[PDB]
Amino acid sequence: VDNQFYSVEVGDSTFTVLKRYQNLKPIGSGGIVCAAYDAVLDRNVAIKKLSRPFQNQTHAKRAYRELVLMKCVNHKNIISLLNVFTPQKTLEEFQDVYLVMELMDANLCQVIQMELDHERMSYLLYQMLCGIKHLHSAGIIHRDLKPSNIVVKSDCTLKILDFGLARTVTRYYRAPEVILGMGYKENVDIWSVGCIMGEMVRHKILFPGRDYIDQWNKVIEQLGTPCPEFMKKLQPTVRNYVENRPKYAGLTFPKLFPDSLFPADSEHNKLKASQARDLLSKMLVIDPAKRISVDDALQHPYINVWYDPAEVEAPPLDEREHTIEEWKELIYKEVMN
Numbered sequence: 461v462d463n464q465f466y467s468v469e470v471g472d473s474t475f476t477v478l479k480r481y482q483n484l485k486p487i488g489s490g491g492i493v494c495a496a497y498d499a500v501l502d503r504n505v506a507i508k509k510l511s512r513p514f515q516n517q518t519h520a521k522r523a524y525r526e527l528v529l530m531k532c533v534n535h536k537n538i539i540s541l542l543n544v545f546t547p548q549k550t551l552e553e554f555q556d557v558y559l560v561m562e563l564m565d566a567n568l569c570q571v572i573q574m575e576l577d578h579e580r581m582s583y584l585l586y587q588m589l590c591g592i593k594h595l596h597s598a599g600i601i602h603r604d605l606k607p608s609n610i611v612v613k614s615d616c617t618l619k620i621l622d623f624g625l626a627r628t629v630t631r632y633y634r635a636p637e638v639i640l641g642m643g644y645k646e647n648v649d650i651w652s653v654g655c656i657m658g659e660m661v662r663h664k665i666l667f668p669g670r671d672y673i674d675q676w677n678k679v680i681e682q683l684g685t686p687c688p689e690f691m692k693k694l695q696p697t698v699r700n701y702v703e704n705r706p707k708y709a710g711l712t713f714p715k716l717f718p719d720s721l722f723p724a725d726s727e728h729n730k731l732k733a734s735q736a737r738d739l740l741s742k743m744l745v746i747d748p749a750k751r752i753s754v755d756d757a758l759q760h761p762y763i764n765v766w767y768d769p770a771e772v773e774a775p776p777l778d779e780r781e782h783t784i785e786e787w788k789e790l791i792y793k794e795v796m797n
């Protein structure tokens with residue numbers, strides 16, 4: 461049963477996988493990820509090694525939620541699992557989980573460093589929004605979208621790699637309502653998409669900062685101090701702190717995103733430029749009550765040329781604390797079924 465597996469050294473770690481997976485190359489560390497050729501499917505795959513994911517509750521809750529959710533969702537813009545396995549034979553010896561998905565070519569950090577035409581940028585954006593809408597329809601509100609957890613192929617197809625934060629580290633993309641602990645709804649994810657869109661245009665992180673204080677300052681000093689209605693939705697403590705900040709009017713969007721940042725040589729590109737700038741202005745809106753929704757962003761002219769009911773309207777529960785040993789059991793049952 462273990463002769464089904466072989467081991468190879470990859471850097472500082474050891475991968476022990478099914479024999480079907482061949483010629484492993486490292487493509488990411490931080491679990492460990494390898495590219496591989498899969499002889500049964502005749503295609504390339506990415507193999508992720510979770511080492512002792514039950515070693516603490518943070519690793520374990522995340523790993524478990526991820527595994528479970530991969531069955532609560534089938535959609536081309538979201539990560540899909542081809543295979544799950546462990547080389548260990550019994551609950552007692554169990555250590556590692558390996559997860560296999562289709563191999564993609566790049567993450568969004570890499571694409572952000574490139575200039576893109578409007579057709580590519582808009583298609584990428586459309587796919588993000590489709591994936592999010594599918595998620596929201598399943599009751600999953602992500603709240604942690606970022607360029608590092610989105611991946612693309614050379615043909616511009618896109619996938620979201622994880623399922624976000626639970627109902628209960630890079631933070632530049634987190635919504636104001638998250639950063640300020642204020643409660644949220646579906647369009648909390650529009651903010652992050654706006655941060656990503658804005659970065660793709662400017663080639664610079666919009667709201668960089670070593671901590672949330674820093675981040676909040678970078679947000680208001682560019683977008684302006686938000687309205688009184690927004691302030692009055694904050695808790696006494698946080699509202700105090702946010703209202704006693706140096707005030708700002710902020711800048712308009714032609715100044716935040718000058719005409720020289722876009723391709724605007726032809727009439728096609730001049731028009732798409734102003735339309736891009738319009739969508740940004742509906743997305744980077746501090747007050748969730750005034751921020752565009754996902755359905756409305758899909759209907760926007762910059763995005764809607766791609767619209768397709770098939771992709772947009774595809775069909776769609778406890779969260780609790782446990783010890784290490786209980787997590788190890790929960791997780792092992794999920795990889796074994």
Ligand SMILES: N[C@H]1CC[C@H](Nc2nccc(-c3cccnc3Oc3ccc(NS(=O)(=O)c4ccccc4)c4ccccc34)n2)CC1
Pocket residue numbers: 487488493506507508522523526527539559560561562563564565566567611621622623
């Ligand atoms: N420079 C290029 C970047 C893209 C690379 N191709 C590629 N294709 C697919 C996935 C990845 C990838 C890269 C780095 C880290 N993770 C990657 O993929 C995964 C992310 C999350 C996964 N889910 S998870 O359960 O492991 C997870 C999610 C969130 C937190 C913890 C664990 C993956 C599961 C199986 C296989 C790959 C997974 N990378 C090729 C090289």
